[PDB]
């Protein structure tokens, strides 16, 4: 909620839509007057073949994993099987049930037992080769976000453990010490971090806008925290410790290089993510509680307009 464009955490609208659809199907089934028993022999058997599809896709997925076992799966075969087939004991019954359900269930439409394995494997291999059963980008982001496999989440936490977690416990003492020597505006006790969404980070801050000008270097294992003041038509409307977010600077440099495999669109994906991750780490943080605030924006307006409203 820091910015109109920062993504929201994934809601349950998707499953809520499945409940919408599931009502329609049950109404349709009783609406068509189809024999209820024949309905059950198809939902289970069709899902039985679908669950048998993962076994064949698992073996194809497994054959490559057997060469990483000394390095990736700490030399254990159980981890190798667990990574490709999920929980073994959970999937062990579903395979036996799929075998038993198919081995005996009468089927108005459906191959016999030996004909089942013939057709099922061919589709599994064809999908692998053609990539037809690929991952949609919308669900690639959803799985990565839920699994926290994002370069942004790594940068945000490193930015916290390395830098913010170390200075903030002693920034209040350092700011209180600084204010005890100077008397005017007022130096805010909250650290300020600029978050240009498009990863546009100049090397210095005084080049960003003339309204923000350098004042002094806050006294300090050496942390050069540059305090700045704001200009509101020739008057200091506020002074605060405003700095850039180094990870957002490196994120821009990440996309430029040709060996990073980091697309221009991907940079915007992990630039908005870094702000939200840094929003919620500080919210629960003990040191960064009522001690820091973030300035997130996107230049299409002046920067100094946003800084003042946060003071």
Ligand X SMILES: CCn1nc(C)cc1C(=O)Nc1nc2cc(C(N)=O)cc(OC)c2n1C/C=C/Cn1c(NC(=O)c2cc(C)nn2CC)nc2cc(C(N)=O)cc(OCCCN3CCOCC3)c21
Ligand Y SMILES: CC1(C)C(=O)N(Cc2c(F)cccc2Cl)c2cc(C(=O)NCc3c(F)cc(F)cc3F)ccc21
In degrees, to the nearest 5, what angle opens at C-alpha 141 toward C-alphas 68 and 129?
A: 50
72 binds a copy of itself (CB under 8 A): yes
Is residue 221 annotated as involved in ligand binding? yes
8 Å CB contact between 188 and 308: no
Let me know if 223 is exposed, middle or buried by CB neighbors in 10 A (0-12, 13-18, 19+): middle
What are the distances in angstroms from CA 84 to CA 51, 78, 79, 88, 137? 13, 10, 9, 10, 21
172 binds ligand Y (CB under 6 A): no
Tell me the longest C-alpha to C-alpha distance in the chain: 90
Q: Which helix (H) or strand (E) holds 229?
A: strand 226-231
- Residue 107 binding target from ligand X, ligand Y, a copy of itself, none, CB below 5 to 8 Å by type: ligand Y
| Candidate ranges 37-45, 194-202, 208-216, 299-307; the one touching ligand Y (CB under 6 A) | 37-45
202 binds ligand X (CB under 6 A): no
| Candidate ranges 39-47, 234-242, 302-310; the one touching a copy of itself (CB under 8 A) | 39-47
Neighbouring C-beta atoms of residue 8, cutoff 10 Å? 7
149 binds a copy of itself (CB under 8 A): yes
Q: Considering the complex, what minimum distance in angstroms separates the CB of residue 230 from a copy of itself?
A: 16
What order do you get walking across the sheet with 187-196 strand by strand? 212-217, 226-231, 236-244, 187-196, 292-297
Which of 223, 285, 304, 310 touches ligand X (CB under 6 A)?
Answer: 223
Between 21 and 109, name the residue whose CB sits nearer to ligand Y: 109
Binders of ligand Y in range 84-123 (CB under 6 A) = 107, 109-111, 116, 119-120, 123
Is residue 79 annotated as involved in ligand binding? no
Let me know if 267 is exposed, middle or buried by CB neighbors in 10 A (0-12, 13-18, 19+): buried
204 binds ligand X (CB under 6 A): no
* Annotated binding-site ranges for 3',3'-c-di-GMP: 158, 163, 221-224, 246
Chain positions contacting ligand Y, by CB under 6 A: 42-43, 45-46, 49, 52, 107, 109-111, 116, 119-120, 123
* Annotated binding-site ranges for 2',3'-cGAMP: 158, 163, 221, 246
């Amino acid at each position: 909620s820091l910015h109109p464009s920062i993504p929201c955490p994934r809601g349950h609208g998707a499953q809520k839509a499945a409940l919408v659809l599931l009502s329609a199907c049950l109404v349709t089934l009783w609406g068509l007057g189809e024999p209820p028993e024949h309905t059950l022999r198809y939902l289970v058997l069709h899902l039985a073949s679908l669950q048998l599809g993962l076994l064949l896709n698992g073996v194809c997925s497994l054959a490559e994993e057997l060469r990483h076992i000394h390095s990736r799966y700490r030399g254990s075969y159980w981890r190798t099987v667990r990574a490709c087939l999920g929980c073994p004991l959970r999937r062990g019954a579903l395979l036996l049930l799929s075998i038993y359900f198919y081995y005996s269930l009468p089927n108005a439409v459906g191959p016999p037992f030996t004909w089942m394995l013939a057709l099922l494997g061919l589709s599994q291999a064809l999908n692998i080769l053609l990539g037809l059963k690929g991952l949609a980008p919308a669900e690639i982001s959803a799985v990565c976000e839920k699994g926290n496999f994002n370069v942004a989440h790594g940068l945000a936490w490193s930015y916290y453990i390395g830098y913010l977690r170390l200075i903030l416990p002693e920034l209040q003492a350092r700011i209180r010490t600084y204010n005890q020597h100077y008397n005017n505006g007022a130096v805010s006790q909250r650290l300020y971090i600029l978050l240009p969404l498009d990863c546009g980070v100049p090397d210095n801050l005084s080049m960003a806008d003339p309204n923000i000008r350098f004042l002094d270097k806050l006294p300090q294992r050496v942390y050069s925290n540059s305090i700045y003041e704001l200009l509101e038509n020739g008057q200091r409307a506020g002074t605060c410790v405003l700095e850039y977010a180094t990870p957002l600077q490196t994120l821009f440099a990440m996309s430029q290089y040709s060996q990073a495999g980091f697309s221009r669109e991907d940079r915007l994906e992990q630039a908005k993510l870094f702000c939200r991750t840094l929003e919620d780490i500080l919210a629960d943080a003990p040191e960064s509680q009522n001690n820091c605030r973030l300035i997130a924006y996107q230049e299409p307006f002046s920067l100094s307009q946003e800084v003042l409203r946060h003071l």
